[PDB]
């Protein structure tokens, strides 16, 4: 199996983003998939989780801002983020709880929100 995470980028405060954690090698109907975020000089913390049924639990800091959805047809989990703030800048990992023998973390994707750093050099 393997977890590959996409999305990521630079957005000014008050923006929105969507992160898709593509999964493979495990029957997608499976243990809940969650999200974690880590920032420099800090440890991993939990963000949200969605179960096989479709029930969802959220961490207090992200309550009312982030949403987590499960898609069986695409075999994917989507994290929608709104009202992002500088404290929300971090690397986001896609955890696959359950199967304690292997947690099989993902590499993660870096997302940063800052006061309009001069944008891409298109």
């Amino acid at each position: 199996r393997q977890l590959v995470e996409s999305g990521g980028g630079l957005v000014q405060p008050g923006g929105s983003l969507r992160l898709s954690c593509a999964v493979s090698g495990i029957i997608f109907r499976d243990n809940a998939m969650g999200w974690y975020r880590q920032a420099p000089g800090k440890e991993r913390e939990w963000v949200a989780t969605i179960t096989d049924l479709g029930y969802t639990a959220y961490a207090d800091s992200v309550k009312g801002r982030f949403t987590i959805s499960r898609d069986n047809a695409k075999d994917t989990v989507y994290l929608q983020m709104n009202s992002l703030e500088p404290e929300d800048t971090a690397v986001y990992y896609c955890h696959l709880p359950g199967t304690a023998a292997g947690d099989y973390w993902g590499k993660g994707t870096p997302v940063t929100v800052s006061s309009l750093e001069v944008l891409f050099q298109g």
Binding site: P40, G41, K42, P86, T89, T112, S114, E117, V118
Partner: peptide, 24 residues
């Protein structure tokens, strides 16, 4: 000591009098 990791992103516990930027 680390001060600013990503251009315009202050590391925790550094006074705000510091700032970053990225010119051309």
């Amino acid at each position: 000591k680390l001060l600013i990791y990503s251009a315009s992103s202050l590391y925790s516990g550094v006074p705000s009098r510091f700032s970053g930027s990225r010119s051309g």
